[PDB]
Symmetry: D2
């Protein structure tokens, strides 16, 4: 189950680079030079890497220090053949963003947030990124009176419209993806789920430039079904990027390697992405646990890819199995894909078999056969067919 | 804190009428005649009542039995001055709906679901209802292979488009409101949150005819902030109706009386609805606990209204307090309501005070004063000012 | 992966017999005769069945009807070789138990609860049961003032002491197991977790007669790690029985078949039970989803056993793998099993290598190698070694 | 609602001293000198302060630096009249504790953990502390194979027994309190709830020296009822200390000021503590949100005390109200406090009114009147009587 760059696996600099600082503890690992992570990831079979501005260029860097950090990074990409398909802005770490970036109560902070983002969009484009992600991790509140949410959504819309105006005025081929999260580090975060982010996009001036970048662990922190949220995103044509990791239920954001956490959810996610033909990066936004040394870091990253490729094999075996195809008909998945009333409203109204002469008890007695189908899916996942 | 019909408080027949059957227990109360609930509610100060088809007319009723149930009900409304502002369909109780109504795998069931709904829209209109609610409580799955969610959302869209075609062809003045719930009775329910429902509406043929009917306990079962979800719904112009009750966290749907559960969330919800000038019904979808006899039923219903009116007083006192108005400026709520960049993109790009000469440390050091503001809100809620 | 009666798999009458009534829906299946479930389970390879009094003998049965229900049941057990290793009382379904059985506020109800339980202990003993389970599903509250919890725990202790007095006075070889659940059907249930139940047992007059009967889905409804709770129960010598099913996170009690829900938790549970040599019944307290007809019922039951036997194979393969044994040493699982200070307190106090000359940075730098170990566990679970 | 030192309000150095570093963000406030927090707290009306070793004496301090930090601190206590009723060890921050302190897999780390704790027990005693708290925040695991929980509980028991041996050999008047938490910073933490900690104490060599120190937000992170857990702790005679804060449901540990989060739970907690006559410190383990400057820090701390005193008034008014005393009898709270069968087992067995002639339907029909009682409690909390 060896990955190759064709599998389109990508990683954040901040993932394998996480030093292990948590709310209750100091760093357990030294900082990684981005050039070293690029080389180590390429050896593992990754396709590319992603970055926040502040991961690549230390906050406060002079223009000259900046050019030198970019130059070194670009040499590592050239040396390894690694791509940079996605970039993003850090609008959460510096104290200035303690009440948000785009929806900070302080107007000067909001204007600053926008300028910091625009600087990084120019960098992302230069590096070849196709998607620019926005995670508004500080947009939200711990208390009810601190944030009027209608006014905040006005400010959020204003920020994203200005960014769309900038990209279109520059003629850039880059699209935006909004990354929802329900809470942490704010007590509640605005646009908390895939659904909220999708609904919000429909009110922007140029909705076609924006999609979503959902994350496994994020939707699971609201106890939601991640494959169901991804199916809605695909149905809307808005899955621009996806972030893969593991999460054990509703608690703090664990960022476990992909495959860990809810293993059956990972299976159904892989089945969906592969059968819908999603062609974007498979990006891992995870943290090697702070229990690990560098060897455990690389083992953790390698495990992300391995688990995706194992699940891909099992899902493909499941859908290809004639016994499963027969079970899917037994469960009327074929009838779910047929229109309810392609004959139209009037014909439906006139159809006595739809109501007056519909035998509800006979219909009610038909079993759905879902448990046999689900055990076939279990047997395939476990290699017990 | 006495309600009057002007306060627009409404109740489901199925609320005070709940017999107390739960997953582990038999009914503890006899059935209520709908006419008796209408009279008892009117004495309490309610404005009106709502119904599922099957609450008013027993499933399977002949055409003549039907006319007689409607006649009696209409006489009680005339006798009391009670309105019927909202109605809905039961697409969840009968075994035929065990895999859904609009998104059942069986096509015949879906066609049946539509015809059952249309019959009840004609009734609702006759009774004067302005909103028709749809809660797809059986639309969903316990296992991954049982429901292809893209095909299900196609079927859901098809159902709602047909309903919009029917209403517009009949010239009815009625709008639809989708009621999201994340789980229960299905393991996961499609359109699980306010956000998912809003995003879905934007893909229907006539989005202007559809809004949301969120419920307190429903969003709280996903651990989400209910006032934040309602602010997004209002921002989108889609809050057509609202359902009020109480819920203690992420667990089964408790349907406690309004004010019970998360009391501070109830406060912030009332503050929002009143300050945004929401003019729709305040509907209570709750269950008097099965511990209660009929006297406890009416005490429970009366408590719903009482708690709304107490919270309304406290929220109004909060916003009117000059010391709070001063705290809100101290916290820059006024600056949140001002555009970030009404000067436009180019002026922002050229503004050195937004980046090159922005003093990030001085901005970072400004406290937000949110804790003093939140303690003023606590003191007002508790009458301790 | 074929079960045989030696695997000690057991099922509740009420499991395969569940008619599909939920809070929002009518039954989808006809009632099963207990004799038919005994025969169908035996054909599937089960070892035995369990029952509440009211599953076997309809509530209110005359003494003669009772003897006849027991006679028929006993003939089915004789015909099939099925055992009855556990029994329990229904103290939750009848309206009289709406505020509890042992901790009802009404003293007459509590006395009734005790007499109903004692009648069934005599039956259980006659049928050969070794464990008598108590699930206090109605012991709890929806509101704070309704139940003084200290007085309720006094009543709970009094009930269990009286039961221990009865069993010992009769010379019965039966032990009790308390089954904790955090909520549902009450808003909060007393003794909500394995830990609470264990702590409570230590205050009974004869603690040696009582243990716990934990359930997968129950602990997971509090977001707790089920294998960790079972390890504490085993550590205390109190795992008298166990109930196996599946649950997807914190929500209503789903009662999915075993292996469904959190699959990796099921793996770690099986690893623990098998390696600790638990010798009690593997009992399934699950519900075939109401989507299913009778064929789906039996497929669901068969899947419970199949998934246990697959997980047993994978866990045994994991622990037997020399590469895993080597990983476990790399992670110092061997050092965790050695006493910290068998040399004693004074020697520890005098040992300069434990503090004065302890090199904390060198210790801090050692990686734990947990991620390689966990990927070996994933590869074994998935058959990808 | 002005606190005075008689109200026994205490605060951790690390509470008002929290610099605002979170998983996603840098500090927003400068460090506080402990002497300054002592003075500022005393002006606010606090009774005392608590500390981890590392809050008072920077990790790695030489013996001389140590004596000087203690001297300064002791002068501030003398200058202000502040007490130190509780102390604790930091076994979570330094990287050496990344896999735990008492249950680290590495034996050398465990021995180190013990020696670090013992050094601080001598300090606590010198400073006059009556309770020594242990929060094993790093005792736990992110993956199943990393920690054998039976062996870990052996190591945990061994650590606590050695500490009890030390205290008794020194003749110290200090008792221990175990502080449970379900998760964070480990994926699952050992002894995750009040119940688990209570059950564990019963297996130590000298159980009388150990109790619990539960925290509001901790139990609520498992969705449990905090007042119910405290009632069980009181019932067992094990509530040695308590930590007060606020938490909005199941998510990361928010540490909001007391009264924030679940306000009705705070009310019922205060009612219990006051009516049970708990005489220990009311300690606040909270964090002023990182949005705040120093003025917001002190406002936040003051709000903790204010909210306790408001809730105390309302709970006392509730219990004193003749209309509530009458409601409590209507709901048979008086009958809950009477023994079920003080007449004994045989008399119960012979009592035909307990079964043979018990009218279950008449008993079933009695309403419990809980909703009227709960609305009286709401009216009292809100000052709307």
């Amino acid at each position: 189950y060896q990955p190759t760059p064709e599998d389109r696996f990508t990683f954040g600099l901040w993932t394998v680079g996480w030093q292990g600082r948590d709310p209750f503890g100091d760093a357990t690992r030294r900082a990684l030079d981005p050039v070293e992570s690029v080389r180590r990831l390429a050896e593992l079979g990754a396709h590319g890497v992603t970055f926040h501005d502040d991961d690549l260029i230390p906050f406060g860097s002079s223009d000259s220090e900046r050019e030198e950090h970019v130059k070194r990074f670009r040499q590592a990409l050239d040396d390894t053949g690694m791509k940079v398909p996605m970039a993003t802005t850090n609008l959460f770490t510096h104290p200035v963003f303690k009440d948000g970036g785009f929806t900070a109560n302080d107007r000067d902070v909001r204007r600053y947030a926008l300028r910091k983002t625009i600087r990084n969009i120019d960098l992302a484009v230069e590096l070849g990124a196709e998607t620019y992600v926005a995670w508004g991790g500080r947009e939200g509140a711990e208390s009810g009176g601190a944030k009027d949410v209608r006014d905040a959504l006005d400010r959020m819309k204003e920020a994203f419209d200005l960014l769309g105006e900038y990209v279109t005025s520059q003629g850039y081929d880059i699209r935006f993806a909004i990354e929802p999260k329900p809470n942490e580090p704010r007590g509640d975060i605005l646009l908390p789920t895939v659904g909220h982010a999708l609904a919000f996009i429909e009110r922007l001036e140029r909705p076609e430039l924006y999609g979503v970048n959902p994350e496994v662990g994020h939707e699971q922190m609201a106890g939601l079904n991640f494959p169901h949220g991804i199916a809605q995103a695909l149905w809307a044509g808005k899955l621009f990027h996806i972030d893969l990791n593991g999460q054990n239920g509703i608690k703090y954001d664990q960022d476990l390697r992909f495959g860990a956490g809810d293993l059956r959810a990972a299976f159904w996610l892989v089945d969906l992405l592969e059968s819908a033909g999603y062609s974007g990066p498979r990006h891992f936004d995870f943290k090697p646990p702070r229990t690990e040394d560098f060897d455990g870091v690389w083992a953790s990253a390698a495990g992300c890819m391995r688990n995706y490729l194992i699940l891909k094999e099992r899902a493909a075996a499941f859908r290809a199995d004639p016994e499963v195809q027969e079970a899917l008909r037994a469960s009327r998945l074929d009838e779910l894909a047929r229109p309810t009333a392609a004959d139209g409203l009037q014909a439906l109204l006139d159809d006595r078999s739809a109501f007056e002469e519909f035998d509800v008890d006979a219909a009610a007695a038909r079993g759905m056969a879902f448990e046999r189908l689900d055990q076939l899916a279990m047997d395939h996942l476990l290699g017990a067919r």
